[PDB]
Amino acid sequence: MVEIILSHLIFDQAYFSKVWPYMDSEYFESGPAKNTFKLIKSHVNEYHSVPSINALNVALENSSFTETEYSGVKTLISKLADSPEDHSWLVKETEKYVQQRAMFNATSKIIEIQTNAELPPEKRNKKMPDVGAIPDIMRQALSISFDSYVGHDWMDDYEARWLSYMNKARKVPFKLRILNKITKGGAETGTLNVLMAGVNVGKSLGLCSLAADYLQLGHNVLYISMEMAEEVCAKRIDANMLDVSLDDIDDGHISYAEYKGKMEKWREKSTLGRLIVKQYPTGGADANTFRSLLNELKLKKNFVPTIIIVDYLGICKSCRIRVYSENSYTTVKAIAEELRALAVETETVLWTAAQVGKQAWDSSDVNMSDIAESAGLPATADFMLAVIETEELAAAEQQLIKQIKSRYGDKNKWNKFLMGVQKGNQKWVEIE
Amino acid sequence: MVEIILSHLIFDQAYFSKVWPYMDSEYFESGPAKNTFKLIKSHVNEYHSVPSINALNVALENSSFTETEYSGVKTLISKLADSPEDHSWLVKETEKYVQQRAMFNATSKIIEIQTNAELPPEKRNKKMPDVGAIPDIMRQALSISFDSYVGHDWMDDYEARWLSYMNKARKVPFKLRILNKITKGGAETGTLNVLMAGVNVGKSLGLCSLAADYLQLGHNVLYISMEMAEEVCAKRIDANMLDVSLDDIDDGHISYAEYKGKMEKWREKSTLGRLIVKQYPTGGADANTFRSLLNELKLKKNFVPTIIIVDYLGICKSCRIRVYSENSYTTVKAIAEELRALAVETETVLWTAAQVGKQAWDSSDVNMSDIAESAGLPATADFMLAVIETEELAAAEQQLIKQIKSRYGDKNKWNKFLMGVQKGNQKWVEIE
Amino acid sequence: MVEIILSHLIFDQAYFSKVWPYMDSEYFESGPAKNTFKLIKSHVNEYHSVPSINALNVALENSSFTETEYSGVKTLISKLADSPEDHSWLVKETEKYVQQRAMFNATSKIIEIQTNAELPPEKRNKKMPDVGAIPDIMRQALSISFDSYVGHDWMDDYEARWLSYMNKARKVPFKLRILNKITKGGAETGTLNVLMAGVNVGKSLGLCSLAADYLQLGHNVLYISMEMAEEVCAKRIDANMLDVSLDDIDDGHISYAEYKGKMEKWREKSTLGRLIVKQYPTGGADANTFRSLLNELKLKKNFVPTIIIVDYLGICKSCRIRVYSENSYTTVKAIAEELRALAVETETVLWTAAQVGKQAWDSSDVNMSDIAESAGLPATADFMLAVIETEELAAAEQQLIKQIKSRYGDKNKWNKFLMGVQKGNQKWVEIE
Amino acid sequence: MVEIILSHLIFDQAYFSKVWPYMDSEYFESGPAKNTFKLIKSHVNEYHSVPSINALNVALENSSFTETEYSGVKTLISKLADSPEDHSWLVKETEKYVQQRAMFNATSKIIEIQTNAEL
Amino acid sequence: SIPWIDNEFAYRALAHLPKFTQVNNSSTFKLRFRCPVCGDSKTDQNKARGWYYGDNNEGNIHCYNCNYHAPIGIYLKEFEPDLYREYIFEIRKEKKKIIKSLPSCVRLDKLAEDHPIIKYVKARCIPKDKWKYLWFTTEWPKLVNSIAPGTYKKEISEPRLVIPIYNANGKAESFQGRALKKDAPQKYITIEAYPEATKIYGVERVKDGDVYVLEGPIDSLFIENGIAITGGQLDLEVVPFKDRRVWVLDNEPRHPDTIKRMTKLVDAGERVMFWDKSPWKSKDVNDMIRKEGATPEQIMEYMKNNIAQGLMAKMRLSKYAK
DNA sequence: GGCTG
DNA sequence: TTTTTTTTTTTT
Numbered sequence A, B, C: 001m002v003e004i005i006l007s008h009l010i011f012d013q014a015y016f017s018k019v020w021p022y023m024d025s026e027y028f029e030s031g032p033a034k035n036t037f038k039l040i041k042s043h044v045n046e047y048h049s050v051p052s053i054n055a056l057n058v059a060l061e062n063s064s065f066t067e068t069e070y071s072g073v074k075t076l077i078s079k080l081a082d083s084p085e086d087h088s089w090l091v092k093e094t095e096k097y098v099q100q101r102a103m104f105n106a107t108s109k110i111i112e113i114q115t116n117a118e119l120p121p122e123k124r125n126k127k128m129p130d131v132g133a134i135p136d137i138m139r140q141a142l143s144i145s146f147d148s149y150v151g152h153d154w155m156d157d158y159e160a161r162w163l164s165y166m167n168k169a170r171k172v173p174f175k176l177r178i179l180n181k182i183t184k185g186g187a188e189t190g191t192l193n194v195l196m197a198g199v200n201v202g203k204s205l206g207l208c209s210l211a212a213d214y215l216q217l218g219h220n221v222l223y224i225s226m227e228m229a230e231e232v233c234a235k236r237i238d239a240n241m242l243d244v245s246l247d248d249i250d251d252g253h254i255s256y257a258e259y260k261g262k263m264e265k266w267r268e269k270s271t272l273g274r275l276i277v278k279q280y281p282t283g284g285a286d287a288n289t290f291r292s293l294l295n296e297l298k299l300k301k302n303f304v305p306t307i308i309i310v311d312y313l314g315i316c317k318s319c320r321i322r323v324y325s326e327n328s329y330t331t332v333k334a335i336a337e338e339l340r341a342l343a344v345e346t347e348t349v350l351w352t353a354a355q356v357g358k359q360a361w362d363s364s365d366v367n368m369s370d371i372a373e374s375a376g377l378p379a380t381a382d383f384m385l386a387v388i389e390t391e392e393l394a395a396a397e398q399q400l401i402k403q404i405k406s407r408y409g410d411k412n413k414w415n416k417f418l419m420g421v422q423k424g425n426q427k428w429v430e431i432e
Numbered sequence D: 001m002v003e004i005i006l007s008h009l010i011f012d013q014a015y016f017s018k019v020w021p022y023m024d025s026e027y028f029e030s031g032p033a034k035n036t037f038k039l040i041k042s043h044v045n046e047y048h049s050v051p052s053i054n055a056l057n058v059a060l061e062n063s064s065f066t067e068t069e070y071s072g073v074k075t076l077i078s079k080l081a082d083s084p085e086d087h088s089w090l091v092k093e094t095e096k097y098v099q100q101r102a103m104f105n106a107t108s109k110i111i112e113i114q115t116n117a118e119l
Numbered sequence E: 001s002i003p004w005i006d007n008e009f010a011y012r013a014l015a016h017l018p019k020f021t022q023v024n025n026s027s028t029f030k031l032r033f034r035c036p037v038c039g040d041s042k043t044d045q046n047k048a049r050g051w052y053y054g055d056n057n058e059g060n061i062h063c064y065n066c067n068y069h070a071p072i073g074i075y076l077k078e079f080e081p082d083l084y085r086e087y088i089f090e091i092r093k094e095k096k097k098i099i100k101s102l103p104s105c106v107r108l109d110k111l112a113e114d115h116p117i118i119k120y121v122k123a124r125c126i127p128k129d130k131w132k133y134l135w136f137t138t139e140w141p142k143l144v145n146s147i148a149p150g151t152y153k154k155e156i157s158e159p160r161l162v163i164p165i166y167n168a169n170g171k172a173e174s175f176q177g178r179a180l181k182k183d184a185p186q187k188y189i190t191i192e193a194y195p196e197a198t199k200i201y202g203v204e205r206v207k208d209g210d211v212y213v214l215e216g217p218i219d220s221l222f223i224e225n226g227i228a229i230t231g232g233q234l235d236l237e238v239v240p241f242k243d244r245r246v247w248v249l250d251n252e253p254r255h256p257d258t259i260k261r262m263t264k265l266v267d268a269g270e271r272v273m274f275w276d277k278s279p280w281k282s283k284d285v286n287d288m289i290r291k292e293g294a295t296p297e298q299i300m301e302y303m304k305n306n307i308a309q310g311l312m313a314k315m316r317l318s319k320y321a322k
Numbered sequence F: 001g002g003c004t005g
Numbered sequence G: 001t002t003t004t005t006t007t008t009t010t011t012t
């Protein structure tokens, strides 16, 4: 590995600028490698630039080495190539090499300290550190890392953090003006967002509308369905995207020509993403099967999603709980925690839906207290939008969206808003 | 000097009473000496007295030993003989020998640790300490002297206790005088302090405000967030310390010039600590994870916190429990016990958050019987606080704190004090 | 160890008195040992006294054997020396030797019986027992020991039981007249006593008051704390003993002159014991840890406790059940049984505390069914008191200590009795 | 054609993108081939990129291999080279080889099952 | 456990088994036998892969063919119940020859330079002065039967390199045969005159200073104060100069048996030699000289610099292990 | 011509 | 992964 390290010190710039401050003579060897590194360090000190092979050989010629040292250094210099390795592997491997050598040196030093300690006090070296310095020395061996990034350091990462607030690095817009207004620019990555459906509201209509909106904005969407097949969910997606009514597809009003024309028109647009629909049996998909699905999609389909939409939280299974109940609070709390952990670890926006409490069903207003999942969903959910469909709203083709929990912004800023739900095309349109 | 040690263990009451409680089988060798000490230790355990030569070579040596082991033990026992030596030189030489053997064992153990950790996973010999805890082993080996320090005698140790009283070397004062007049000088080092607020009532505004106050007081603060990213927590801290509304940093009413100016104005102050924010997925961090994070911070960033703020106690996991339990009482109690053990081990004031019961939602008063996750959590906490701002305090930007459990003083003295919340700046101000 | 047995039969006296009745010629050997024991037994039968070495030589001379063995016997009686070994070890080793030889003889006898049974009845031996006698004689070899007492006999041992009534030898007074009245002499040795109360009610306060009262009655009190630090418990004890409020210590209203003066005034008392306060991590100590602590306390100092105050048993761990293998009931029952076993082994009064259920935290009356964790803890306890505090009681600095369980007296004579509680001084006073 | 498969996994990118998700360690003989594929798979799992020859020689030195295994892996790594061919014959040949290896493994497994049943 | 009664009882039980041989050195008790469970090798009728080891705490039988491994008590309980009865009852009951001449052996220094064995030892690059410590024979079974008769049934003429071993007195008590042909029963055939003979080559040539102990007698010829244990018991005790010996084995970092012997030596607190900074890569010093062009005095330079003891030796072994 | 755990 | 006892706890 030392040959590679020296070669890419001589014949690289980013690697040099990254690993030079953490490079010491004692890390290499007691033979040709140490002499070559000493030549490199001397040249960089006298001339603040990376030496070339000819300059290195000139320095070796004008240097004080014996015959064996001269031969070793000459052979090692002749054995260095400008080959192109990847930067990440090179940095990680040289970091591991440096750490191993530092640990070996520290262990040898503490062994020598102990050996010197067990010697006649009249007869010992004064320069050798005392035994009490052993725990600190090993610490200096363990404090060797090319790059230190343990968490977010306030007052040490304020310039990077400001670039996050200006660039809105975490926000993902909604394509609906009202939803962008109440989220201060959309939902955030690594979040769990749920919709609460009162009596008479479907949970998959809103999820399909969000999936279509994200698809039109260029995002990779992974729709995991539980109670429905892939074809049915993709048919809801087609209804929203192709403007064809859902019943028109089953009846046969729309022909193959119009369908293919609309699909190719969408394919021509470069602002379109990819939608992958995966079906799982009811209760047969925990938030560990989703990790395997993501791994398979990344490896085989190269599909790395930014939006993950689960059809229904209640139908899912809690991996930690293991046991499965049709409508149990402990499972819903665990499922929410597991899904939010998946969202955080995958840096994706995760969407799901739940049913509101029966009292919430009868009452147009839904309270966090009036929720089927109490203290379990309004504790692990960054955003919880509530959807109310009464007779008067249904007659006007509308649904009252109420904001029950908003980690993003103030919940009471714009709490109630009317949404233009179309149940045929499975779409949400804004209301002026 | 194994032979002298064994001989004066057998044939000296004063030497025995002085050196036996500090004797261990891992000090002599891997041969006859270890077997002889095993026989002596078994005899002392069984009969609470020093064995004689007859007991050693008849009542004990007739055991499950190899021919070579039997011959070695017989030779060593026959070689034991009382020798006249001063009982100040014997104790000192025995102490030196014990210290040397402890250092040798520690060096061998850390060598084995490095060798094991160098190996790839699936063969890494679990339960063996990581490379991070090398210096603590050496430090423990250093302090292996023969001093009797078992507990705190009441009459023999009143000087150190009075020094602790006058120095007050347990209190960490708040920046709020109201929280200092009820805690009699702030929170104590090895303690677990809890906030109970509900859903979207506080419970992280309070934790962020406490972190900001501790930062302004020069303390190193470690904010481990399980429900929010590092950037959002740091944004709340920025809103608290820069006197800028949380919405202003999102819409864009604050320029980069004044942001950088305020940050540099805070930097130049010597009375400012370091705040490090680290995020973990919801339900994927235990006390062992926190210990690993602390070791990593100490080694790499040279960061030893005095305040540890866990954003939520109930969405962590138990290190001791291996199989997830649907019973929230045992899991939350175990998590709280592990967190308090970590706090008392690191001597760090540990603040965390707890969720109140749905009954307490929109309730003008919250009792200790409103704790949601577990009734064992209030038993392990050193100081709990409840936030009960229902409807009218919100209109007046107020929050009422009840002081449900107070181990620093009488909770019936100043039960309510009506804290001045500010949600835009995410801070607490007094009503002085 | 036949040489030791014979030597201590000839020379030692108390060993002879204890071991001679359980001695038979079949237990030793078929060679020189058997002949020597036969000579000793013949001499002790002729003259009812232990013979001497010269007497043994005379007996060998007058009563002769065949020279082949006679030389071995005369060289066998050349090594019997005084060798003042300890009595307990000698008795135990002799008992083990005779038990082993009895097992060997019984096995040989049953083998001989089986061999005889196989032989035809024509030539079979008549002295050998039948096969049906094989089990019972084996039992005769199983129940061989030096314990002259197998149990307690009501009529045979009426004496040595009246002695336990004149001198209590179990009662430890309480220093409080009400507790002595309801206990009829105080708590007994080898017992488990429990104070049960809600969270933040006075349990550690009561335990510290009891520890202070015991300390004033010349008792060795060991306070083992699983939650609070040693300094906090010592501060409670100082507040109880030095008549200084807790607020005074944390407000600096007491000088070092007063503190040292009061401490030395207590030291000058000849009626003062020792109070060692030991801290363990929550859930990180068991009964075996307590036994190791007692052993090291006895070794490293002249400290053998008579009172052991465990702060809370619920936050300990069982030394038999693996961690979190069983539910709360089984684990807490096992912990209580282990603590009571430790108490009966060490002959000490073991006080502890337990939590009540969530339903009893705001109740004016506490029943035995309100015990948290196991219901086997009341079964295992010997004396249980319930500490009840309400608003009216707190307004008068009083509590409502109620007898839940009493093996020392009738719980109905004085079931509920008010007790003044000075929380500032952490002291229990009795209303008079 | 294990050597060709390894060579075009290392030195080719379209071939790697096409065939890697379907390759498995059980498709290679227990000699140098399986160990070399283990090194490649570990490198890809740890760095999400195709290793070079230097990377594998570093991984070989930092490995717990016997002398015979070490020599075989080093010889196989030395023998690797980028032979120019067409990215339509390579994919089908690799698919055929993988199918044959899967059939061989299945046959061995069913023979073992039948041997186990008669016990 | 009781080892000697296990040795006595095991012998009788394994005595019935064919191919029964008593491998009894000065400090161990082993019994070689055909395995009664599987019949040992079906193809080779003369293989005895069943072994009994009685030098441990418990005497155990192990088969290297069918992987049977059991205590002697379980073996007696399962196969010899009449012997098992008395075994548990007795358990309950207690509970020099000097090689004066070498016939048909010629020393290498008095041989002609055109001898084919002289070309081979020149190909092995042994220095000339050591050639008076080496003999050559063509009648190796005849020589062994002249020393220890009966080991070779037929004295077929085999050319082998004679390796006499002398004690500290300089008297030959054993001799080893190096196989010149590639096809042989054994690479190194060690023949003793009396069973307590020394197995350490060249003890009579030890001068003052550190003593380097190697694995090959030919390897010790390049080494000043170089002696070599010829396998056998590998007893450190039977090895002299315990205060000052140097423990040199062959360069094999990935070989598990070599590092097992290194771990056994370093746990005994001995002075073990480490090849972790060696510029050469061959297995032994003779192979280093023959194949990598190494001269001996460079090797005398390297080892002295890297002599290791105790804890520092442990880390050297930790990094040399893999 | 030996070799196990 | 289910099954059954008992307990303790909590949520509705």
Ligand SMILES: Nc1ncnc2c1ncn2[C@@H]1O[C@H](COP(=O)(O)OP(=O)(O)OP(O)(O)=S)[C@@H](O)[C@H]1O
Binding pocket: A378, A379, A380, A407, A408, A409, A410, A411, B197, B198, B199, B200, B201, B202, B203, B204, B205, B206, B227, B246, B247, B423, B424
């Ligand atoms: N961006 C924001 N702008 C203004 N107010 C906010 C913002 N984020 C949160 N809040 C307010 O802060 C409170 C929310 O409490 P937090 O400190 O976020 O913790 P929490 O939400 O109570 O914890 P949970 O488990 O998510 S309910 C509410 O009063 C919100 O109105």
Ligand SMILES: Nc1ncnc2c1ncn2[C@@H]1O[C@H](COP(=O)(O)OP(=O)(O)OP(O)(O)=S)[C@@H](O)[C@H]1O
Binding pocket: B378, B379, B380, B406, B407, B408, B409, B410, B411, C197, C198, C199, C200, C201, C202, C203, C204, C205, C206, C246, C423
């Ligand atoms: N450090 C302290 N300073 C002042 N008053 C205290 C202190 N500790 C306890 N008290 C008072 O004494 C009461 C009982 O405390 P303890 O007896 O220690 O409680 P406990 O029974 O151990 O239960 P916890 O630990 O509080 S759940 C408290 O409610 C306070 O009124």
Ligand SMILES: [Mg+2]
Binding pocket: B202, B203, B204, B227
């Ligand atoms: Mg929060």
Ligand SMILES: [Mg+2]
Binding pocket: C203, C204, C227, C228, C311
């Ligand atoms: Mg307490």
